[PDB]
Amino acid sequence: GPGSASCLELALEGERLCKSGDCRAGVSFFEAAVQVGTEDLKTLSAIYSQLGNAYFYLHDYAKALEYHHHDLTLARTIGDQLGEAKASGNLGNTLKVLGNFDEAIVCCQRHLDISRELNDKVGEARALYNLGNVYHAKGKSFGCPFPEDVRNALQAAVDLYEENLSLVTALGDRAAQGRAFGNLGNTHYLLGNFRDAVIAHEQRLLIAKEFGDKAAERRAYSNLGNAYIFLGEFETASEYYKKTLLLARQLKDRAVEAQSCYSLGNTYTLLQDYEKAIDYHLKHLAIAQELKDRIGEGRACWSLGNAYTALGNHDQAMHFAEKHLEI
């Protein structure tokens, strides 16, 4: 009665608050809305779906799984083909993060299949990107970052992302393109198709620069740096690694300053400028002191000592070694 009205109102404050960067409050409003309760089952189910998504973004995958599973069940109750496909996708993506790869696959496939039956091309592209991500995580998860199931999972992600790119091109979805170019690039990378990794990551660059997505932009320079190292072109990687270090400064991200610092530190180890590693790995040990990742200070000390052993300063290297001995 008066509740089926205060429920939806309470949902909107939950909804609004999550687009505004505060899901931690919006959840409380979603949870409040559920306490009150409506009797329109598509409305309650939609609240479950948003509780699920809000907990996803907040990193409570456990309670996220629980809410998407509820929304899915209601969808089957109600017979809402389209609700069921979206809840299947969300279950899928949640299970993927939990490492329930095999069930992730079935759920994303259910999302895709219904999307296709309905001739929903937006749903089909989203379902395709989700299925790709599952295969991609499945293969990335195996071992250290041999088994033929790895190659086969990764190859399956390549086909899925390429299928997705083809659909979101046709739909004009520049942001979807960038996301598929990045995951596709990183998949080609793990397969040893480095020439194809560069091609995809250059598309992600362009689209990130276009949107002004300055986090994505450095993301691609770094990923580009990775791929040139394995290509053996260490000077290009250095070029790309520096570019990442700059965007880290303006972003005021002392973290990716360091990761970019250590990595171009390690890159010139292959180029004999042990100073660039020194000058960087000291910025590494400094910022890692700031964030208590001093663990890497020993990694910097282990790399700095070994640049030193090729290049003098034996007493400074033993001091680095002495600190590395700290753990």
Binding site: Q50, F56, N183, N186
Partner: peptide, 15 residues
């Protein structure tokens, strides 16, 4: 290797 975000389906609130 820095990936791309996952993208969930949103099921907005009906009137």
């Amino acid at each position: 290797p820095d990936s791309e975000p996952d993208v969930n389906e949103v099921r907005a609130l009906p009137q």
